[PDB]
C-alpha cells in the first residue's frame, strides 16, 4: 500500500532516537514550507521498560515498567517501515504539527503518550513494540 499511513510501526534509523521504535501518527506525504521532504510525525519510545521477572516484586516492578516516550518529526528516509502495526487513536490529538513548536505543548504531549504507552504495556499489547532493538 501507500504503506506509510496512520498506525505503522517503524524503527528510527538516524539521530539520537536511532534504533528506537516509533508509531506514525500523522504523515505529511508531501513537503512542508519548512520540512521540504516527505516526513512523518511519530511517537516513539526513548527509554524502554526494562525486563521484569518473578524476582521483581511490588514496587521494583512498578519501577522497571516505567517508560520514557518521545515524539518527532522525521524524514521518511530515516524510518524503516515495519510489518508490525499499533493503534494511535488515544493520541491522534496529542501529536499535532501544532504540538511541536512551543515546548510546553510537546511536554504535555509526551505526558499523554507516556501514560498512553504504559497502559498499553501492561496487558502486553504490541509486545514487540516494548523491547529494545539490539544492534
Amino acid at each position: 500500500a501507500k504503506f506509510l499511513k496512520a498506525g505503522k510501526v517503524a524503527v528510527v534509523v538516524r539521530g539520537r532516537y536511532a534504533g528506537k521504535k516509533v508509531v506514525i501518527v500523522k504523515p505529511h506525504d508531501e513537503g512542508s514550507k519548512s520540512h521540504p521532504f516527505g516526513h512523518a510525525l511519530v511517537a516513539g519510545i526513548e527509554r524502554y521498560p526494562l525486563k521484569v521477572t518473578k524476582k521483581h516484586g511490588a514496587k521494583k516492578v512498578a519501577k522497571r515498567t516505567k517508560i520514557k516516550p518521545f515524539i518527532k518529526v522525521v524524514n521518511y528516509n530515516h524510518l524503516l517501515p515495519t510489518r508490525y502495526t499499533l493503534d494511535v487513536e488515544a493520541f491522534k490529538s496529542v501529536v499535532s504539527t501544532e504540538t511541536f513548536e512551543q515546548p510546553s505543548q510537546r511536554e504535555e504531549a509526551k505526558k499523554v503518550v507516556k501514560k498512553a504507552f504504559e497502559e498499553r504495556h501492561q496487558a502486553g499489547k504490541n509486545q514487540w513494540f516494548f523491547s529494545k532493538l539490539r544492534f
Partner: protein, 112 residues
C-alpha cells in the same frame, strides 16, 4: 641572522624533540618544544576518523568534559553513524528473517 638552541638536554632530532621558533616580548628568538600531534580517533568499525569528536593525546582526554568524547546517538563516540545505520537495518531484517525461517521450517516438520 639570529640562531637558537634546544631547551632539553637531548641534542638529537627525535620525534619527541620537535622544535619551533618564536619571537618573545623581549624581541628575540627562542626555541619552544612541540608535543607530537594528536591523531583523530577512528570508528572502530569502518575505520574513518570519526566526526564530532575532539582530538587530543590519550591522557589529555581525562581532562575534558564528556561532550568532547561523544556524539549523541547510540554507539556515539564509538562508531560512524552510517555504520550504525547499517547495524540498525541489518539487525532488524535478520531478526525478522529469523522468524520467517522459523515458521517455514515449522511448516515443513508438519508437512512431510
Amino acid at each position: 641572522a639570529q640562531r637558537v638552541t634546544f631547551r632539553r638536554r637531548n641534542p638529537y632530532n627525535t620525534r619527541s624533540n620537535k622544535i619551533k621558533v618564536v619571537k618573545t616580548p623581549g624581541g628575540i628568538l627562542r626555541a619552544q618544544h612541540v608535543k607530537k600531534l594528536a591523531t583523530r580517533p577512528k570508528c572502530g568499525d569502518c575505520g574513518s576518523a570519526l566526526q564530532g569528536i575532539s582530538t587530543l593525546r590519550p591522557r589529555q582526554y581525562a581532562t575534558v568534559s564528556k561532550t568532547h568524547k561523544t556524539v549523541s546517538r547510540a554507539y556515539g563516540g564509538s562508531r560512524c553513524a552510517n555504520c550504525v545505520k547499517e547495524r540498525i537495518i541489518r539487525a532488524f531484517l535478520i531478526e525478522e528473517q529469523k522468524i520467517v525461517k522459523k515458521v517455514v521450517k515449522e511448516q515443513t516438520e508438519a508437512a512431510k
